[PDB]
Amino acid sequence: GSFVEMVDNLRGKSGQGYYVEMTVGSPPQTLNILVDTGSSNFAVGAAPHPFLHRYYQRQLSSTYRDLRKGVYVPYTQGAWAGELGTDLVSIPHGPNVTVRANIAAITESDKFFINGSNWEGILGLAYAEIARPDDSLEPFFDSLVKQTHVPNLFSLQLCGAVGGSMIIGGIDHSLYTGSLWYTPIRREWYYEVIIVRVEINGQDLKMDCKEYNYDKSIVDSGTTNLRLPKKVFEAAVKSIKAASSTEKFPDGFWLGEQLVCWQAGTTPWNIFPVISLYLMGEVTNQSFRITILPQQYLRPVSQDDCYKFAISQSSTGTVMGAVIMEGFYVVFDRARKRIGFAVSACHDEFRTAAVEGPFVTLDMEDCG
Amino acid sequence: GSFVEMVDNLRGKSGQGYYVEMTVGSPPQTLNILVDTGSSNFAVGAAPHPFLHRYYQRQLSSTYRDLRKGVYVPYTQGAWAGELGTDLVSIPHGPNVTVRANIAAITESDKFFINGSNWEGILGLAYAEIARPDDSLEPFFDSLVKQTHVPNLFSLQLCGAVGGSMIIGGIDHSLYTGSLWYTPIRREWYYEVIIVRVEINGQDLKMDCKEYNYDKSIVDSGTTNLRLPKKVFEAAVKSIKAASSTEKFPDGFWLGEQLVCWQAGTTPWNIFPVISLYLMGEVTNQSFRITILPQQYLRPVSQDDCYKFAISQSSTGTVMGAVIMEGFYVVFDRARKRIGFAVSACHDEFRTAAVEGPFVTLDMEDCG
Ligand SMILES: CC(=O)Nc1ccc(CN2CCC3(CC2)C(NC2CCCCC2)=NC(=O)N3c2cccc(F)c2)cc1
Numbered sequence: 055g056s057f058v059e060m061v062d063n064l065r066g067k068s069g070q071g072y073y074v075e076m077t078v079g080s081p082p083q084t085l086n087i088l089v090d091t092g093s094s095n096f097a098v099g100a101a102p103h104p105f106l107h108r109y110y111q112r113q114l115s116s117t118y119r120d121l122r123k124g125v126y127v128p129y130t131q132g133a134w135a136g137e138l139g140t141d142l143v144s145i146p147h148g149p150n151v152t153v154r155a156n157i158a159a160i161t162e163s164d165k166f167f168i169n170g171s172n173w174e175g176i177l178g179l180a181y182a183e184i185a186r187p188d189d190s191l192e193p194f195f196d197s198l199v200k201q202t203h204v205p206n207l208f209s210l211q212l213c214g215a216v217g218g219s220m221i222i223g224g225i226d227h228s229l230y231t232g233s234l235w236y237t238p239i240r241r242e243w244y245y246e247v248i249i250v251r252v253e254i255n256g257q258d259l260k261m262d263c264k265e266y267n268y269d270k271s272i273v274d275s276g277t278t279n280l281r282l283p284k285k286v287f288e289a290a291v292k293s294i295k296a297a298s299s300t301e302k303f304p305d306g307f308w309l310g311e312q313l314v315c316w317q318a319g320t321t322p323w324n325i326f327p328v329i330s331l332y333l334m335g336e337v338t339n340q341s342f343r344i345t346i347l348p349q350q351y352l353r354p355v356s357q358d359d360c361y362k363f364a365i366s367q368s369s370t371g372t373v374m375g376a377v378i379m380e381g382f383y384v385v386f387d388r389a390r391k392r393i394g395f396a397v398s399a400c401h402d403e404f405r406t407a408a409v410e411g412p413f414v415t416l417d418m419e420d421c422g
Numbered sequence: 423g424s425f426v427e428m429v430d431n432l433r434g435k436s437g438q439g440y441y442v443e444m445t446v447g448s449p450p451q452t453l454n455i456l457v458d459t460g461s462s463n464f465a466v467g468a469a470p471h472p473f474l475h476r477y478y479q480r481q482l483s484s485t486y487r488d489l490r491k492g493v494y495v496p497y498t499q500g501a502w503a504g505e506l507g508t509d510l511v512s513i514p515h516g517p518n519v520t521v522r523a524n525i526a527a528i529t530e531s532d533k534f535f536i537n538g539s540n541w542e543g544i545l546g547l548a549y550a551e552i553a554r555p556d557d558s559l560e561p562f563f564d565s566l567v568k569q570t571h572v573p574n575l576f577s578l579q580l581c582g583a584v585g586g587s588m589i590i591g592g593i594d595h596s597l598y599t600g601s602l603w604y605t606p607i608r609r610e611w612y613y614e615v616i617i618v619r620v621e622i623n624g625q626d627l628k629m630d631c632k633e634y635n636y637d638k639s640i641v642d643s644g645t646t647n648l649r650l651p652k653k654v655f656e657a658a659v660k661s662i663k664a665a666s667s668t669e670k671f672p673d674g675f676w677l678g679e680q681l682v683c684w685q686a687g688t689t690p691w692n693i694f695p696v697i698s699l700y701l702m703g704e705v706t707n708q709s710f711r712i713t714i715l716p717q718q719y720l721r722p723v724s725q726d727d728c729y730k731f732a733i734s735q736s737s738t739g740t741v742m743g744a745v746i747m748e749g750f751y752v753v754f755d756r757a758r759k760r761i762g763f764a765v766s767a768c769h770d771e772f773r774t775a776a777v778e779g780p781f782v783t784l785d786m787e788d789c790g
């Protein structure tokens with residue numbers, strides 16, 4: 055139980071992201087920061103905004119150093135602009151260290167902050183290759199490992215409906231049951247992995263495995279959904295529809311355009327299939343599988359329980375977002391270039407999320 | 423309001439001391455630490471003890487370094503023994519820094535820990551001259567200032583009945599009203615000061631001022647009482663008795679051997695005198711005075727309110743303990759070798775604690 059003080063250091067509202075407290079500058083300014091394994095910049099709201107309860111005040115921090123360079127980070131859905139600098143940073147419920155880190159002070163944004171989320175910045179935990187303005191801006195975790203003796207590893211327990219744990223520098227055995235199964239990090243930019251097989255209720259989707267990782271597959275704590283490449287999305291929806299045919303749903307439900315609601319406590323979880331993603335293992339021809347329940351891929355949105363189908367389509371590869379992570383204790387073992395999955399200590403009485411192996415899967419190298 | 427996150431970072435039970443959270447080692451181990459300006463060792467309970475809710479577990483800290491030397495710290499009333507080492511230390515509700523500090527792991531003690539106090543160690547904030555085993559063991563605050571940019575200053579707001587604030591690296595203007603008055607630190611060992619005059623209800627005690635500082639006068643957050651040298655104690659008690667003669671008290675009350683209790687809300691504060699200590703100022707022949715109310719020097723010990731007279735005798739000089747500090751915001755300005763007093767933002771409807779000046783006092787140098 056040595057990592058006990060980091061347990062339950064994450065909070066969130068359902069579907070709006072998990073955040074950790076980080077303390078920046080001198081004297082201390084503590085903010086709520088989105089934990090985001092799908093980006094690589096540490097950035098904080100630094101000016102008033104309708105959706106922010108507070109923001110970073112650089113003028114009040116004696117240890118703040120303006121890098122006198124701007125930074126812009128755009129996505130499909132939203133973007134922010136700000137000014138680069140460095141400052142002292144700690145994580146009060148994380149490792150017992152203080153580092154000098156790059157920090158982007160967000161002065162303007164479009165569709166970035168979420169009304170009511172309670173977070174005021176983002177902690178990009180992915181690698182420098184995808185940092186903005188470029189890969190010379192050292193990400194936070196790189197600084198942490200370079201400046202301290204903290205082991206080059208973190209792990210995430212995301213508990214759905216929110217709370218969870220980010221263990222920095224180690225693995226907490228109370229956060230999981232059974233064994234940890236590891237898949238290689240294919241390339242250090244995003245947390246890129248290789249999906250070798252997909253099943254819906256034990257039935258192989260039977261697509262060429264290249265399609266599952268078409269253009270990449272990433273593990274992303276900052277994305278809510280399981281996102282699938284279009285061809286894979288279509289086949290997966292066809293199969294899920296067929297397996298859940300004891301009730302019919304509007305087409306728009308599968309497209310996230312319509313919600314379905316059930317009276318409190320009556321959601322027929324039993325009618326929906328389990329989904330298995332097989333991941334490349336650490337030994338030649340060996341794989342393992344992670345299995346998710348409808349409780350993960352149907353996300354709650356007061357007499358009625360409304361759900362949105364949280365599998366969606368992508369044109370930029372597969373994104374294993376929070377719907378996948380919530381079933382699991384996930385280990386970002388950067389030191390050994392691998393990601394681990396185990397059943398989370400945070401299902402129903404008939405079925406459980408699972409991590410199972412080993413399986414024999416040949417030509418897995420062909421899937422990338 | 424830049425020091426806001428350090429406000430209210432102290433807790434305590436009445437008469438049992440004020441403590442701050444400190445986080446030691448890797449992974450983090452957070453303990454409650456007595457804030458003690460009357461000693462100079464950082465030391466923590468490191469083995470089970472009936473009176474400890476928790477203790478430091480060196481074996482669980484990867485960053486702990488055994489100095490392989492023992493340490494023993496004795497007082498009149500109590501003592502502890504332990505092992506010297508170093509480890510990473512932060513103060514989660516103090517400065518945003520992490521330092522490597524000397525830490526004594528307390529393995530045995532006699533009459534040191536207090537049953538029910540909620541603290542598990544001590545933070546000796548005084549100077550190296552009085553560190554054990556000797557002055558080569560750098561105290562915590564010295565390490566803090568040497569390793570970081572934190573200004574060489576702290577201040578204490580002790581709020582009586584408990585809570586309070588320790589502001590590290592600065593002064594928080596919301597914690598006091600009126601002006602700060604400074605007295606020199608005569609010598610850097612204890613926080614030694616010079617008392618130049620004492621009044622009971624505005625009446626000069628008329629003792630030679632050398633007696634007030636006979637052998638030293640110190641400011642000590644770890645001592646509950648105002649402690650006075652015997653000759654001064656006797657004169658002060660005679661005067662307080664005379665000024666409070668509208669009611670009579672047993673002799674043992676003035677000696678702390680007897681308590682007196684009053685039905686809730688009926689304590690006749692009005693019958694007891696105010697006490698003024700005049701302190702050497704920063705300019706030639708200039709002094710100022712701090713004035714304390716019976717609410718400070720009568721300390722509460724359920725239909726009745728019991729009090730102990732918290733002025734007591736000493737054979738080792740005057741000790742301005744928590745009964746003095748509680749009236750005031752106290753600034754330990756180590757950088758400018760001076761201690762500041764202002765009226766605390768934490769009295770009755772007729773009288774208030776006060777810090778007043780300037781007064782003309784000649785030959786103050788003769789008082790040491
Ligand atoms: C209002 C709101 O919901 N705020 C929000 C939510 C969440 C987040 C973390 N991330 C940032 C980035 C994110 C996924 C989530 C992305 N991801 C990747 C590109 C490369 C390939 C594989 C996905 N595409 C996007 O359009 N994103 C995106 C999504 C929503 C808003 C946004 F501003 C960007 C930030 C901001």
Ligand SMILES: CC(=O)Nc1ccc(CN2CCC3(CC2)C(NC2CCCCC2)=NC(=O)N3c2cccc(F)c2)cc1
Binds near residue numbers: 439644
């Ligand atoms: C059980 C308990 O009450 N625990 C306690 C209380 C408080 C504390 C902080 N300090 C430590 C030291 C203290 C004053 C308070 C001291 N002070 C000075 C010497 C030099 C000259 C001017 C006073 N004399 C003593 O006998 N002390 C002393 C007092 C009580 C217990 C004890 F173990 C030592 C520690 C431990």
